[PDB]
């Protein structure tokens, strides 16, 4: 299970410039002086003036170039208010939408706390783009299985601490949080908890930061909040008591291939993972949480699929390794302003 | 209060600028060269040292003695005509 | 663009190309230095100028030498023989 | 291993990989200026010093065996005459 970093600090990407205005031919460029950043350049740019960071680097890949500003096709860019590089400290490790999972499949989604890297995940920062990531305040030491960056794969804390302290690491990793690696594998067929329960307040604070930190209300009464999810949603949650024979990967493929392929379950999305059996503040037990969400204007497809899952357990629970299966569901859909 | 390094267009020329006490350095790997039109700069700058050493030898030869051989011979041609 | 001063890459190499009748200039502050790998530019230029001035005085001394020096030694000892 | 324009405390470093080069290339009338000093003029001055030294060595050849000793036969017979 690989987690890939989505954003970048590339020069030729409009979103990285102040209010999405990329530098135009023959114009002025400014990187904020005190911002430490590594920027990958891949295209040619005619520049009249460019202020570099006090501590940083512009990497010149194949195709990269900087030339003087002429006047012919430069008249447009002219004297129009320099392009400024956006704050390159704005990317948080605990932001769910900055990570992409290698297990993504049709009809499958993941709760918010499992969208950031988990304990047994392999983290990849793509070398095709420069990056910078911050480990937020508090944010108890992130520990993953491995971190790949700059063509290297760190599996030992000794190698990682050397790189993170070096100038190459400090150009790309900042923040007070601690980062570590440990090569252990899960090896439990019933799964492993993501391990981000203690960091969930920081994961949700990063996710809800564009919204002032407040969850938007779900469009249903008695909305559910599954384990690892930041805000309420509409749908159903099935909790399985797993026996020693439960194969979490096979059971997840069972829902995706056997049930979601049926016509009466079209347009439904499922999230399957082992979660703590409790939000209990003190060292609780585990369960298999199945989150069922129906997007679009449909019936209780989530509740109907939830009942089909309980029926499949009542019929094949012994062979599937499920000892007990409960469920809960959200209420009626609200059509106005909540 | 440190001045930002700057790349600018100036009278049609590409210009790189640093602050009061900030350097501009060109650094290659252990097997790389710095060239100006196929000429290796490191060998030209080493020629400065070779030129310095050959001048030291020339200063110690018949040319250079802060009273020239021409000066000494001039003195005895002087004294013997006298 | 491609005819005017520019900085580009070529198979891993960093290339500064001035083009015709234009310059690529690197300027530091009053107290800054320019380093060409391990060589200091200003330190090199000072030695170039010193070598140039030393060559000028060595060249003027070589020209000022009489072409008679060997004849002058025998001249001096044909008079010492006379003495 | 890619070329980069790195900065540290306002210092500007053009850094190149292990076996890569930093190559200045000029056209007709094009110049590379390092703190207002023409790089090509400096390389030519090194070469002119190299060639002026070669000729100065040639003018040092053909000089007497070593006139330094022949200096102490000048004053030796000046002391004789007095």
Numbering used by the authors:
A (entry chain A): 20 to 357
B (entry chain D): 38 to 119
C (entry chain C): 38 to 120
D (entry chain B): 40 to 121
Copy text from the publication.
The intestinal uptake of B12 is a complex process that requires binding to the carrier protein ‘intrinsic factor’ (IF) and uptake of IF-B12 by the intestinal cubam receptor. Cubilin has been suggested to form trimers, which are anchored to the apical membrane via interaction with the type-1 transmembrane protein amnionless (AMN). AMN is formed by an extracellular domain, a transmembrane helix and a short cytoplasmic domain harbouring two adaptor protein-2-binding signals (Phe-X-Asn-Pro-X-Phe) for ligand-independent internalisation in clathrin-coated pits. As cubilin and AMN depend on each other for proper processing and translocation to the apical membrane, disrupted interaction of the two proteins leads to retention of both in the endoplasmic reticulum (ER).
For structural analysis, the ectodomain of AMN (20–357) and an N-terminal fragment of cubilin (26–135) were co-expressed in Escherichia coli. Crystals of the AMN(20–357)–cubilin(26–135) complex were obtained and the structure determined to 2.3 Å resolution by the single anomalous diffraction method. Electron density is observed for the entire ectodomain of AMN and for cubilin residues 37–120. The structure reveals a receptor architecture, where three cubilin chains combine into an intertwined β-helical structure that docks on to a corresponding β-helix domain in AMN. AMN forms a bean-shaped structure protruding ~60 Å from the plasma membrane and is composed of four structural entities. The fold of the two N-terminal domains of AMN (denoted β-helix 1 and β-helix 2) is similar and is formed by right-handed β-helices with hydrophobic cores. The head is formed by a three-turn intertwined β-helix, which irreversibly interlocks three cubilin chains. In the C-terminal region three cubilin chains form a coiled-coil, which is interrupted midway owing to the presence of a proline residue (Pro103). The cubilin interface with AMN is formed by the N-terminal strands of three cubilin chains (residues 42–49), which combine into a triangular face with a hydrophobic centre formed by Met44.
